Write a protein that binds this ligand. Structure first.
Ligand code: ALF
Length: 90
RNA sequence: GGCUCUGUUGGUUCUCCCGCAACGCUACUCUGUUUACCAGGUCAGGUCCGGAAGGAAGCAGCCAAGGCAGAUGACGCGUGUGCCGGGAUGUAGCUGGCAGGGCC
């Protein structure tokens, strides 16, 4: 809504396929803002979803795209490598 | 100014197979101690046979070994990691691009 206020078009992307009902939550937040939200399912690859979200945003000429991520502790290296994979794909 | 679904293509999930790299799981054995005579070995002391030479049954101690524990390698069972790994397969499910219609 903050980015919806000055007239910038906003689209949301769900990057958490791990936690339960995160997709549905961001879909609720997306419905409250009356803006399209791109997500697939729980368990899906996050980097792929975010990638497709950016591609779609480029095709739909979306001004601002916000990409969510899964909650992760810093002491976990594999999740850090996953996030690095997300960035690398982006 | 947005959206949906077809044509084509890129991913992803599930089922099956496999490679590399990156994180995590039992039963046995090594040490800690334990088990009087009635599994075994060495068997002190003592005792049995003998003039002598020497053998003998065998307690304790010790070592296996049998109970109970502290953890060591391979078998057995798993995976929200990376190479968007390589493949098989869906009449599948989800997502994106493009050629676009049409709906507003
Ligand atoms: F949405 Al969360 F940990 F609760 F990423």
């Amino acid at each position: 809504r903050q980015f919806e206020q000055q007239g910038k078009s906003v689209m949301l992307a769900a990057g958490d396929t791990f936690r339960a009902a995160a997709v549905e939550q961001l879909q609720v937040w997306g419905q409250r803002n009356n803006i399209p939200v791109i997500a697939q399912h729980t368990g899906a690859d996050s980097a792929s979803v975010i990638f497709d979200a950016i591609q779609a945003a480029k095709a739909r000429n979306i001004d601002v795209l916000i990409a969510d991520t899964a909650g992760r502790l810093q002491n976990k290296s594999h999740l850090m490598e996953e996030l690095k994979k997300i960035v690398r794909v982006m």
